[PDB]
Amino acid sequence: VKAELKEKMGYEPTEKDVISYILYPKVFLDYQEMINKYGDVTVLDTPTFYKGMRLGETIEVELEKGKILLIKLNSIGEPIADGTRVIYFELNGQPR
Amino acid sequence: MNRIKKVLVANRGEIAIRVMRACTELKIKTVAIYSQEDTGSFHRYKSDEAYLVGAGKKPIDAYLDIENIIEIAKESGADAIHPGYGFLSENIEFAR
């Protein structure tokens, strides 16, 4: 299994990652797939985690000791053909 | 480029931008600073990061908040500061 997972996961798993997979396989991969997509969300303040951001709101998130992202949401783009829309942010003052 | 990895641009407008351009041409990260009245000035969008500086200060006084700028410089990880021209370009206290 440890090898099955390693092939399933991007890389080599820890002992803990393994048991978890065994106990909850469907969810553990789903969890992995999700963490790859969005990164370690554990860090976001709860309201942001459940409610996202208000327009013109600015928040800070601590990814690690001393590593803070200043994040502001300016406005939200209009949808295009296939429903996609651009969201307008300022990550660390720099527009993104 | 050797011991400057990142630089703060302690100015606004045309001159601020020219510096940013220089840094980027030299693979040096850049940090901008904007007063409340300059949330709009497109020098702040031209950097790799940006922070408000002169909080509650009169608009010209805002780019002269020496102490604030150093805290911003220190929190950013900025190896150096370029004061451009005018404002704190010639101010001794800041230089020291």
Tab-separated table of C-alpha atoms in Angstrom:
chain	number	residue	atom	x	y	z
A	1	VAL	CA	0.000	0.000	0.000
A	2	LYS	CA	2.760	2.428	0.992
A	3	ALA	CA	4.039	2.044	-2.573
A	4	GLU	CA	0.498	2.124	-4.019
A	5	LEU	CA	-0.038	5.482	-2.276
A	6	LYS	CA	3.370	6.860	-3.286
A	7	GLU	CA	2.366	6.184	-6.917
A	8	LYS	CA	-1.124	7.588	-6.180
A	9	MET	CA	0.268	10.594	-4.336
A	10	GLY	CA	2.832	12.913	-5.947
A	11	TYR	CA	5.688	11.681	-3.716
A	12	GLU	CA	6.875	9.424	-0.834
A	13	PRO	CA	4.361	9.296	2.096
A	14	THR	CA	5.000	9.360	5.847
A	15	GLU	CA	3.904	6.536	8.153
A	16	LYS	CA	0.853	8.567	9.244
A	17	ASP	CA	-0.250	9.401	5.692
A	18	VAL	CA	-0.393	5.655	5.121
A	19	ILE	CA	-2.727	4.631	8.011
A	20	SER	CA	-5.030	7.478	7.139
A	21	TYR	CA	-5.180	6.239	3.514
A	22	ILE	CA	-5.973	2.714	4.679
A	23	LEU	CA	-8.754	3.930	7.007
A	24	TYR	CA	-10.271	6.464	4.622
A	25	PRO	CA	-8.985	5.858	1.086
A	26	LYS	CA	-11.646	7.632	-0.986
A	27	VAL	CA	-11.392	10.748	1.186
A	28	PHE	CA	-7.611	10.756	1.619
A	29	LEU	CA	-6.967	11.006	-2.100
A	30	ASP	CA	-9.817	13.541	-2.391
A	31	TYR	CA	-8.065	15.461	0.368
A	32	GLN	CA	-4.715	15.215	-1.439
A	33	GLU	CA	-6.242	16.341	-4.779
A	34	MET	CA	-7.777	19.281	-2.971
A	35	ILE	CA	-4.652	20.298	-1.118
A	36	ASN	CA	-2.693	20.264	-4.392
A	37	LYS	CA	-5.283	22.548	-5.967
A	38	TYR	CA	-5.572	25.107	-3.111
A	39	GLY	CA	-2.543	24.444	-0.859
A	40	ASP	CA	-2.635	24.253	2.932
A	41	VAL	CA	-5.910	25.966	3.812
A	42	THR	CA	-5.605	25.051	7.512
A	43	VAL	CA	-4.144	28.576	7.865
A	44	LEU	CA	-7.052	30.796	6.704
A	45	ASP	CA	-9.163	32.569	9.318
A	46	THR	CA	-12.410	30.673	9.681
A	47	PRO	CA	-14.775	33.293	8.248
A	48	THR	CA	-12.646	33.569	5.135
A	49	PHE	CA	-12.544	29.726	4.904
A	50	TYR	CA	-16.348	29.455	4.886
A	51	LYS	CA	-17.381	32.855	3.432
A	52	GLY	CA	-14.500	33.922	1.178
A	53	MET	CA	-14.061	37.699	0.883
A	54	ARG	CA	-16.227	40.800	0.707
A	55	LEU	CA	-15.463	43.411	-1.978
A	56	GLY	CA	-12.767	45.872	-0.966
A	57	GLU	CA	-11.954	43.721	2.017
A	58	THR	CA	-8.383	43.172	3.001
A	59	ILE	CA	-7.184	40.228	5.057
A	60	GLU	CA	-3.862	38.791	6.203
A	61	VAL	CA	-2.968	35.127	6.225
A	62	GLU	CA	0.003	33.609	8.076
A	63	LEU	CA	1.393	30.727	5.981
A	64	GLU	CA	4.267	30.086	8.440
A	65	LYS	CA	6.016	31.978	11.249
A	66	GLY	CA	6.759	35.471	9.875
A	67	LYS	CA	5.301	34.861	6.393
A	68	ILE	CA	2.110	36.926	6.001
A	69	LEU	CA	0.102	37.545	2.766
A	70	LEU	CA	-1.701	40.837	2.626
A	71	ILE	CA	-4.698	40.120	0.403
A	72	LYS	CA	-7.315	42.530	-0.905
A	73	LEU	CA	-10.206	41.833	-3.213
A	74	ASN	CA	-10.975	44.790	-5.404
A	75	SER	CA	-13.649	43.568	-7.766
A	76	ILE	CA	-15.079	40.561	-9.544
A	77	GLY	CA	-15.050	40.093	-13.321
A	78	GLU	CA	-18.112	39.589	-15.490
A	79	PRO	CA	-18.747	36.087	-16.769
A	80	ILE	CA	-17.755	35.149	-20.314
A	81	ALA	CA	-19.079	32.435	-22.652
A	82	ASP	CA	-18.248	29.320	-20.646
A	83	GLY	CA	-19.088	30.964	-17.270
A	84	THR	CA	-15.478	31.793	-16.329
A	85	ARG	CA	-14.818	35.165	-14.705
A	86	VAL	CA	-11.660	36.922	-13.620
A	87	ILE	CA	-11.378	37.889	-9.955
A	88	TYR	CA	-9.311	41.024	-9.241
A	89	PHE	CA	-6.946	40.842	-6.248
A	90	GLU	CA	-3.986	42.625	-4.641
A	91	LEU	CA	-1.673	39.999	-3.187
A	92	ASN	CA	0.984	41.943	-1.280
A	93	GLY	CA	-0.159	45.232	-2.843
A	94	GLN	CA	0.645	43.848	-6.312
A	95	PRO	CA	-2.405	43.441	-8.407
A	96	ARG	CA	-3.149	39.892	-9.446
B	1	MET	CA	23.857	40.979	-8.902
B	2	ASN	CA	25.464	40.419	-5.493
B	3	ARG	CA	24.201	41.453	-2.011
B	4	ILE	CA	20.954	43.343	-2.967
B	5	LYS	CA	18.251	40.740	-3.604
B	6	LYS	CA	15.290	43.063	-2.986
B	7	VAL	CA	14.853	46.848	-2.932
B	8	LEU	CA	12.336	49.303	-1.590
B	9	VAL	CA	11.428	52.361	-3.639
B	10	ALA	CA	10.790	55.166	-1.143
B	11	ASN	CA	9.035	57.356	-3.668
B	12	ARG	CA	6.062	57.669	-6.004
B	13	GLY	CA	5.357	58.402	-9.656
B	14	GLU	CA	7.626	58.527	-12.702
B	15	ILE	CA	10.809	58.205	-10.683
B	16	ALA	CA	9.534	55.302	-8.623
B	17	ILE	CA	8.741	53.411	-11.781
B	18	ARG	CA	12.136	54.095	-13.411
B	19	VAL	CA	13.799	52.463	-10.395
B	20	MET	CA	11.527	49.448	-10.483
B	21	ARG	CA	12.376	49.013	-14.122
B	22	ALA	CA	16.048	49.133	-13.288
B	23	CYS	CA	15.708	46.497	-10.567
B	24	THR	CA	13.665	44.130	-12.602
B	25	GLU	CA	16.212	44.479	-15.416
B	26	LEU	CA	18.733	43.323	-12.751
B	27	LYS	CA	16.638	40.447	-11.332
B	28	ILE	CA	16.072	42.413	-8.133
B	29	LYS	CA	12.679	42.156	-6.437
B	30	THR	CA	10.933	45.510	-5.843
B	31	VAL	CA	8.634	46.903	-3.165
B	32	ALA	CA	6.497	50.035	-3.617
B	33	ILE	CA	4.958	52.405	-1.126
B	34	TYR	CA	1.831	54.499	-1.608
B	35	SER	CA	0.002	57.112	0.391
B	36	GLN	CA	-3.725	56.951	0.923
B	37	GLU	CA	-4.216	59.481	-1.871
B	38	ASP	CA	-1.997	57.302	-4.109
B	39	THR	CA	-3.878	53.983	-3.880
B	40	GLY	CA	-4.619	54.804	-7.509
B	41	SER	CA	-1.140	55.734	-8.797
B	42	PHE	CA	0.047	53.113	-11.246
B	43	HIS	CA	3.568	53.089	-9.800
B	44	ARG	CA	2.188	50.901	-7.018
B	45	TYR	CA	0.936	48.309	-9.504
B	46	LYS	CA	4.340	48.270	-11.270
B	47	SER	CA	6.185	46.693	-8.316
B	48	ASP	CA	6.442	43.092	-7.145
B	49	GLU	CA	4.848	44.121	-3.798
B	50	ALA	CA	3.280	47.244	-2.328
B	51	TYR	CA	2.184	48.683	1.006
B	52	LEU	CA	0.379	51.779	2.189
B	53	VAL	CA	2.689	54.117	4.154
B	54	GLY	CA	1.483	57.488	5.414
B	55	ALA	CA	-1.539	56.400	7.387
B	56	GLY	CA	-3.724	59.283	8.551
B	57	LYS	CA	-0.921	61.637	7.465
B	58	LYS	CA	-1.323	64.714	5.275
B	59	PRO	CA	-0.620	63.641	1.688
B	60	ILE	CA	2.894	65.072	1.296
B	61	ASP	CA	3.866	64.130	4.891
B	62	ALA	CA	2.985	60.502	4.083
B	63	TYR	CA	6.105	59.750	1.968
B	64	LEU	CA	8.286	61.284	4.670
B	65	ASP	CA	7.228	58.972	7.531
B	66	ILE	CA	10.817	57.817	7.872
B	67	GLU	CA	10.229	55.390	10.719
B	68	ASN	CA	7.195	53.786	9.061
B	69	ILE	CA	9.181	53.239	5.878
B	70	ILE	CA	11.959	51.395	7.758
B	71	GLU	CA	9.459	49.119	9.507
B	72	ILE	CA	7.970	48.490	6.047
B	73	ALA	CA	11.495	47.970	4.707
B	74	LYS	CA	12.361	45.562	7.508
B	75	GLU	CA	9.051	43.605	7.323
B	76	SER	CA	9.436	43.308	3.512
B	77	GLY	CA	12.955	41.820	3.683
B	78	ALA	CA	14.286	44.730	1.655
B	79	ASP	CA	18.092	44.673	1.426
B	80	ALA	CA	18.162	48.324	0.350
B	81	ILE	CA	16.150	51.531	-0.175
B	82	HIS	CA	16.126	53.898	-3.134
B	83	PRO	CA	14.668	57.291	-2.299
B	84	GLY	CA	14.520	58.555	-5.873
B	85	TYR	CA	14.406	62.340	-5.937
B	86	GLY	CA	12.579	64.869	-3.789
B	87	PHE	CA	10.964	63.680	-0.551
B	88	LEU	CA	13.593	61.813	1.488
B	89	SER	CA	16.215	61.795	-1.294
B	90	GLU	CA	18.394	64.326	0.567
B	91	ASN	CA	17.084	63.905	4.167
B	92	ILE	CA	20.029	63.081	6.471
B	93	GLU	CA	18.091	61.543	9.373
B	94	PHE	CA	16.717	58.891	6.994
B	95	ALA	CA	20.090	58.327	5.322
B	96	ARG	CA	21.681	57.745	8.756
